[PDB]
Design an enzyme around this catalytic site. Structure first.
Site, PDB file in Angstrom:
ATOM      1  N   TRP A   1     -47.311 -36.668   4.489  1.00 25.91           N
ATOM      2  CA  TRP A   1     -45.975 -36.239   3.897  1.00 25.91           C
ATOM      3  C   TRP A   1     -45.203 -35.192   4.646  1.00 25.91           C
ATOM      4  O   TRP A   1     -43.919 -35.027   4.480  1.00 25.91           O
ATOM      5  CB  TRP A   1     -46.220 -35.734   2.454  1.00 25.91           C
ATOM      6  CG  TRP A   1     -46.962 -36.826   1.679  1.00 25.91           C
ATOM      7  CD1 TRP A   1     -48.287 -36.852   1.351  1.00 25.91           C
ATOM      8  CD2 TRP A   1     -46.418 -38.095   1.279  1.00 25.91           C
ATOM      9  NE1 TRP A   1     -48.590 -38.054   0.679  1.00 25.91           N
ATOM     10  CE2 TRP A   1     -47.452 -38.820   0.633  1.00 25.91           C
ATOM     11  CE3 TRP A   1     -45.121 -38.659   1.331  1.00 25.91           C
ATOM     12  CZ2 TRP A   1     -47.245 -40.094   0.100  1.00 25.91           C
ATOM     13  CZ3 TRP A   1     -44.910 -39.922   0.810  1.00 25.91           C
ATOM     14  CH2 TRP A   1     -45.983 -40.634   0.197  1.00 25.91           C
TER      15      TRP A   1
ATOM     16  N   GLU B   1     -49.904 -40.830 -11.908  1.00 29.27           N
ATOM     17  CA  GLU B   1     -48.922 -39.872 -11.411  1.00 29.27           C
ATOM     18  C   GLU B   1     -49.467 -38.420 -11.250  1.00 29.27           C
ATOM     19  O   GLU B   1     -49.294 -37.757 -10.209  1.00 29.27           O
ATOM     20  CB  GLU B   1     -47.702 -39.912 -12.351  1.00 29.27           C
ATOM     21  CG  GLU B   1     -46.921 -41.277 -12.310  1.00 29.27           C
ATOM     22  CD  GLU B   1     -46.156 -41.469 -11.002  1.00 29.27           C
ATOM     23  OE1 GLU B   1     -46.185 -40.536 -10.159  1.00 29.27           O
ATOM     24  OE2 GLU B   1     -45.536 -42.527 -10.800  1.00 29.27           O
TER      25      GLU B   1
ATOM     26  N   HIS C   1     -49.571 -40.639  -7.426  1.00 26.36           N
ATOM     27  CA  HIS C   1     -48.172 -40.488  -7.090  1.00 26.36           C
ATOM     28  C   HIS C   1     -47.952 -40.643  -5.610  1.00 26.36           C
ATOM     29  O   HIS C   1     -48.630 -39.923  -4.815  1.00 26.36           O
ATOM     30  CB  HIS C   1     -47.799 -39.068  -7.456  1.00 26.36           C
ATOM     31  CG  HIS C   1     -46.378 -38.716  -7.150  1.00 26.36           C
ATOM     32  ND1 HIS C   1     -45.333 -39.134  -7.936  1.00 26.36           N
ATOM     33  CD2 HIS C   1     -45.837 -37.929  -6.180  1.00 26.36           C
ATOM     34  CE1 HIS C   1     -44.201 -38.622  -7.459  1.00 26.36           C
ATOM     35  NE2 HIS C   1     -44.489 -37.854  -6.417  1.00 26.36           N
TER      36      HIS C   1
ATOM     37  N   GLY D   1     -39.862 -35.406  -2.404  1.00 31.47           N
ATOM     38  CA  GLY D   1     -40.311 -34.175  -1.894  1.00 31.47           C
ATOM     39  C   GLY D   1     -39.860 -32.979  -2.715  1.00 31.47           C
ATOM     40  O   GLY D   1     -39.616 -31.865  -2.165  1.00 31.47           O
ATOM     41  N   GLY D   2     -39.627 -33.206  -4.011  1.00 33.26           N
ATOM     42  CA  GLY D   2     -39.276 -32.073  -4.871  1.00 33.26           C
ATOM     43  C   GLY D   2     -37.924 -31.490  -4.528  1.00 33.26           C
ATOM     44  O   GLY D   2     -37.660 -30.429  -4.904  1.00 33.26           O
TER      45      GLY D   2
ATOM     46  N   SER E   1     -39.624 -40.405  -6.540  1.00 25.11           N
ATOM     47  CA  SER E   1     -39.839 -39.029  -7.011  1.00 25.11           C
ATOM     48  C   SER E   1     -38.511 -38.311  -6.973  1.00 25.11           C
ATOM     49  O   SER E   1     -37.568 -38.724  -7.694  1.00 25.11           O
ATOM     50  CB  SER E   1     -40.927 -38.319  -6.185  1.00 25.11           C
ATOM     51  OG  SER E   1     -41.447 -37.138  -6.853  1.00 25.11           O
TER      52      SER E   1
HETATM   53  P1  LIG Z   1     -41.506 -35.686  -6.002  1.00 23.37           P
HETATM   54  O1  LIG Z   1     -40.364 -35.492  -5.101  1.00 23.37           O
HETATM   55  O2  LIG Z   1     -42.877 -35.856  -5.317  1.00 23.37           O
HETATM   56  N1  LIG Z   1     -41.785 -34.471  -6.887  1.00 23.37           N
HETATM   57  C1  LIG Z   1     -40.921 -34.309  -8.026  1.00 23.37           C
HETATM   58  C2  LIG Z   1     -40.577 -32.797  -8.055  1.00 23.37           C
HETATM   59  C3  LIG Z   1     -43.226 -34.184  -7.086  1.00 23.37           C
HETATM   60  C4  LIG Z   1     -43.534 -32.780  -6.313  1.00 23.37           C
END
Ligand SMILES: *P(=O)(O)N(CC)CC
Ligand SMILES: *[C@@H]1O[C@H](CO[C@H]2O[C@@H](C)[C@@H](O)[C@@H](O)[C@@H]2O)[C@@H](O[C@@H]2O[C@H](CO)[C@@H](O)[C@H](O)[C@H]2NC(C)=O)[C@H](O)[C@H]1NC(C)=O
Ligand SMILES: *[C@@H]1O[C@H](CO[C@H]2O[C@@H](C)[C@@H](O)[C@@H](O)[C@@H]2O)[C@@H](O[C@@H]2O[C@H](CO)[C@@H](O)[C@H](O)[C@H]2NC(C)=O)[C@H](O)[C@H]1NC(C)=O
Ligand SMILES: *[C@@H]1O[C@H](CO[C@H]2O[C@@H](C)[C@@H](O)[C@@H](O)[C@@H]2O)[C@@H](O)[C@H](O)[C@H]1NC(C)=O
Ligand SMILES: *[C@@H]1O[C@H](CO)[C@@H](O)[C@H](O)[C@H]1NC(C)=O
Ligand SMILES: *[C@@H]1O[C@H](CO)[C@@H](O)[C@H](O)[C@H]1NC(C)=O
Ligand SMILES: *[C@@H]1O[C@H](CO)[C@@H](O)[C@H](O)[C@H]1NC(C)=O
Ligand SMILES: *[C@@H]1O[C@H](CO)[C@@H](O)[C@H](O)[C@H]1NC(C)=O
Ligand SMILES: *[C@@H]1O[C@H](CO)[C@@H](O)[C@H](O)[C@H]1NC(C)=O
Ligand SMILES: [Cl-]
Ligand SMILES: [Cl-]
Ligand SMILES: [Cl-]
Ligand SMILES: [Cl-]
Ligand SMILES: [Cl-]
Ligand SMILES: [Cl-]
Ligand SMILES: [Cl-]
Ligand SMILES: [Cl-]
Ligand SMILES: [Cl-]
Ligand code: NA
Ligand code: NA
Lengths: 527, 176, 176
Positions: free
Chosen positions: A80, A323, A436, A114-115, A196
């Site tokens: 990642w 998840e 996830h 990526g949050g 995500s």
């Molecule tokens: P995603 O972008 O992986 N995420 C939602 C905040 C999980 C860290």
């Protein structure tokens, strides 16, 4: 040689052999002025026009961002992390086209997760050359600004308005509208897809008036804007912007001065302070994310959803069976990717403190009450399994199911999947199950590459998803029509039918996590 | 197939092989072992029970169909024979309520629930376990063909058990 | 079958024979002659036209299906080949309206009617002959699959042309 003329100049791509065939790839096309100096924290500014040939022959810089250093040398985590240089000069995109040049191809636009603090379009698991080769769609992906650089907000003020990184995605959807016919693409058939935070992004472009006419359909993998991590409040955003200033000695009194000061800081100083803008966070912290800015987002998006104020079109929405698990090794007591992580009741309890920081005590007892009525109290992995379900049900699964319901109540076809297959090549341990992030390589077709050590049942599984994803994009209907496949029913309130994706048999089921999500959805928001 | 389908046009038997051996995929070594058992139990038990239930229910009566999926912790037969014919009976009769007896905890709970559903069916014509937040057991209708799965983990509502297999046994095979 | 179904699993072809040779009954000498032609026209024309019509109509549009059953009084091919492929065309184009031409009276009337239905379809999207107490041509729906028969004696409304045959070509054969 392959040169395409764009509105801002010519671009040269490169040929690639994929599966005894050829895809043309234009990696690294710029789509805005670099957001440096005076432009830092501002809305992306359109691109100037260049004579000569821009060479789109490698991936570009990824946007500045903190990196996951928890498991150095470990592929599960490091797959990642960014794989091109970081730089503020990261406003680039990628186009992959079938060879020969298609005539009026459907377009799939990927938005990474990526949050909102990390990520990049150039990861191996986002490589759209298999989709182009296999389904003859065009794949587009874009880098957009993450962290404070992309989401710092001082509401109302164009020097740092908020949501810049959503504006980066937008300006990229625009470049596709203006430029993709040149490449053989149909601007009138564009489907956004993302995972995500990238999926939450897709769901907000469904809500944004400025994005309405820059795409046709949406796919949301493990994410939607109603997830608890997805939208920062005005309250919190200010606190955070001021906390950031404070930490970089940039406290001023003229907010326009706070920003000018922050623009003198150097990217690392900013990055280095992000994690502490909050008294405590969690492994799921989104310090600088989307805010209601009165521009991209005109009102709290829960209100827009409830009251039917979004683009009317089909959606495909999905989640994975486990998840929550991936987050438990980033700070929950007794968890480790290097053992079976049987934790205790008291560990489960300390873990809720990890994930539910403030967090009435009664709130947390209520989670424990709901999730620990064992059947029965014998099983040693009881509390380990409950913590992960807690985390993924709260953060991903129920908010995706609630989005799908509410969206569908306004009349549009919606399809919901439950992804249950664990990768034969997963580096994370078995107990973390169907994690996830691990459907993505199936969606992108990486298992169609036989050179690659996935099982046969995995090739077949991914070929089918690719086909369903592509039929959804071209035709608004995620069916695999040729191979006696289970038919994918629309999701309705009332029935809530969803389709399970796994190697053995796919099923039609109903009301995923009905009991759990009644909890997260009706009760918890009250505590 | 010759063992189980003695006379038994050759084409009859090829047709069973055709239906049951379109592998997904031809890799798996227990493919043919798993197919022979499905052949035998689908032909002999599962499709005829599903067809009875449909036809019976078409005349207006409530009907409930279960799919029993739990393998006894004490089964003496090997693992590959899975959830065998005959091995729900000890759950129906409550033998796992006897703790002296070496069944798991999840098996006691499972059998207590079946006992309760069997007994409610008998007294009240409705196989519900009403007290313990149990999955509600829907009637079986032609059209939906909802059935309930019985296992230790989570019981489910599903639809159209072996739809593809039983179309075969039910429409086509009787012709050969 | 080897002529028409070249590669063509052996079981594929037995399956066609099984479906088409369950005689009623095994007495009739033109049994196998009649079966080969039905095989060929059901596989190649009739079921695929019926499946197109169903699927097309499921998206909401009006669709009308005819079954042409009249053999030309002037057909040069022998009687056993019956109502042949290609031999409605001269009715559609009106060649029987030319009396100079040796078609029966019932053929002029038949072709005048088709011409009228074809032309009303084109101008108005509805293949009705509205003036002469003609049978009304119902739309074709999935579910009912009503079609209209075209012949000199009486035209009929019928349903589900070759239901049993086309279940075969349509569900089963594509699998072999
Ligand atoms: P995603 O972008 O992986 N995420 C939602 C905040 C999980 C860290
Ligand atoms: C809104 O922000 C204030 C700021 O507090 C922070 O100072 C930052 C620069 C950063 O270092 C951060 O870690 C630090 O906490 C928050 O006030 C703090 O809140 C906690 C708990 O309430 C207290 O223990 C701190 O002493 C307190 N600090 C000060 C100086 O007042 C405030 O909590 C925050 N709101 C939230 C909860 O997000
Ligand atoms: C599974 O491992 C966890 C993680 O902690 C450890 O990682 C191990 C693989 C090993 O290297 C160990 O030394 C390292 O600390 C264990 O949780 C830890 O439990 C230990 C035992 O005292 C505590 O000291 C730690 O506080 C705790 N770590 C943290 C910070 O969470 C866990 O006990 C182990 N359990 C098993 C085998 O199920
Ligand atoms: C390419 O097709 C154009 C329209 O195709 C789309 O119609 C949209 C409304 C949407 O449903 C998409 O999913 C469809 O594929 C057409 O108007 C263009 O003129 C075509 N351009 C070409 C061939 O150059
Ligand atoms: C673009 O790449 C080609 C390689 O053939 C070449 O013309 C030239 O070196 C490049 N232009 C640059 C480096 O700006
Ligand atoms: C604050 O001072 C800055 C200097 O540029 C300017 O942006 C702004 O007009 C000032 N705001 C006021 C009116 O205090
Ligand atoms: C359809 O079936 C063929 C052969 O059985 C297989 O090779 C292919 O993977 C399938 N296509 C899709 C879209 O799944
Ligand atoms: C109902 O619940 C109790 C306690 O949770 C349990 O002991 C009993 O087995 C249950 N009864 C039935 C009918 O399943
Ligand atoms: C209608 O009827 C008349 C007289 O009965 C006949 O001459 C003519 O062929 C008919 N027209 C059509 C459209 O069939
Ligand atoms: Cl237990
Ligand atoms: Cl399937
Ligand atoms: Cl569930
Ligand atoms: Cl396999
Ligand atoms: Cl239950
Ligand atoms: Cl089944
Ligand atoms: Cl006879
Ligand atoms: Cl008539
Ligand atoms: Cl018929
Ligand atoms: Na409560
Ligand atoms: Na058959």
């Amino acid at each position: 040689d392959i040169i395409i003329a764009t509105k801002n100049g010519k671009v040269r791509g490169m040929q690639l052999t994929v599966f005894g065939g050829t895809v043309t790839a234009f990696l690294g096309i710029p789509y805005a002025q670099p957001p440096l100096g005076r432009l830092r924290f501002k809305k992306p500014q359109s691109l100037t026009k260049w004579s000569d040939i821009w060479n789109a022959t490698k991936y570009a810089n990824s946007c500045c961002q903190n990196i996951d250093q928890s498991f150095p040398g470990f592929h599960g985590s490091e797959m990642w992390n960014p794989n091109t240089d970081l730089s503020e000069d990261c406003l680039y995109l990628n186009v992959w086209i079938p060879a020969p040049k298609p005539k009026n191809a459907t377009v799939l636009i990927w938005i990474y997760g990526g949050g909102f603090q990390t990520g990049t379009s150039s990861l191996h698991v986002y490589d759209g050359k298999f989709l182009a080769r296999v389904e003859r769609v065009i794949v587009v992906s874009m880098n957009y600004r993450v962290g404070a650089l992309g989401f710092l907000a001082l509401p109302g003020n164009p020097e740092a308005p908020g949501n810049m990184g959503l504006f980066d995605q937008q300006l990229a959807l625009q470049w596709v509208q203006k430029n993709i016919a040149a490449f053989g693409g149909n601007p009138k058939s564009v489907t956004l897809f993302g995972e995500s935070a990238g999926a939450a992004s897709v769901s907000l472009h469904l809500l944004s008036p400025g994005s309405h006419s820059l795409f046709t359909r949406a796919i949301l993998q493990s994410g939607s804007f109603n997830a608890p991590w997805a939208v920062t409040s005005l309250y919190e955003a200010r606190n955070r912007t001021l906390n950031l200033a404070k930490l970089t000695g940039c406290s001023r009194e003229n907010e326009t001065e706070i920003i000018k000061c922050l623009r003198n800081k150097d990217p690392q100083e900013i990055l280095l302070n992000e994690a502490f803008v909050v008294p405590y966070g969690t492994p799921l912290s989104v310090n600088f994310g989307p805010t209601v800015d009165g521009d991209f987002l005109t009102d709290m998006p829960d209100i827009l959803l409830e009251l039917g104020q979004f683009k009317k079109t089909q959606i495909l929405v999905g989640v994975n069976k486990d998840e929550g698990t991936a987050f438990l090794v980033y700070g929950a007591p007794g968890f480790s990717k290097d053992n079976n992580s049987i934790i205790t009741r008291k560990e489960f309890q300390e873990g809720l403190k990890i994930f539910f920081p403030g967090v009435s005590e009664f709130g947390k007892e209520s989670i424990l009450f709901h999730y620990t009525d064992w059947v029965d109290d014998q099983r040693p992995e009881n509390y380990r399994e409950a913590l992960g379900d807690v985390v993924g049900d709260y953060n991903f699964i129920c908010p995706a199911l609630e989005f799908t319901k509410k969206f569908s109540e306004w009349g549009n076809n919606a399809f919901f999947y439950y992804f249950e297959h664990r990768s034969s090549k997963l580096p994370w341990p078995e107990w973390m199950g169907v994690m996830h992030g691990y459907e993505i390589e199936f969606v992108f077709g990486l298992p169609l590459e036989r050179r690659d050590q996935y099982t046969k049942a995995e090739e077949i599984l991914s070929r089918s998803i690719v086909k369903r994803w592509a039929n959804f994009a071209k035709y608004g209907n995620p069916q695999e029509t040729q191979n006696n496949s289970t038919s994918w029913p629309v999701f309705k309130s009332t029935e809530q039918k969803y389709l399970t994706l796994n190697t053995e048999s796919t099923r039609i089921m109903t009301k995923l996590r009905a009991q759990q999500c009644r909890f997260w959805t009706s009760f918890f928001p009250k505590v």
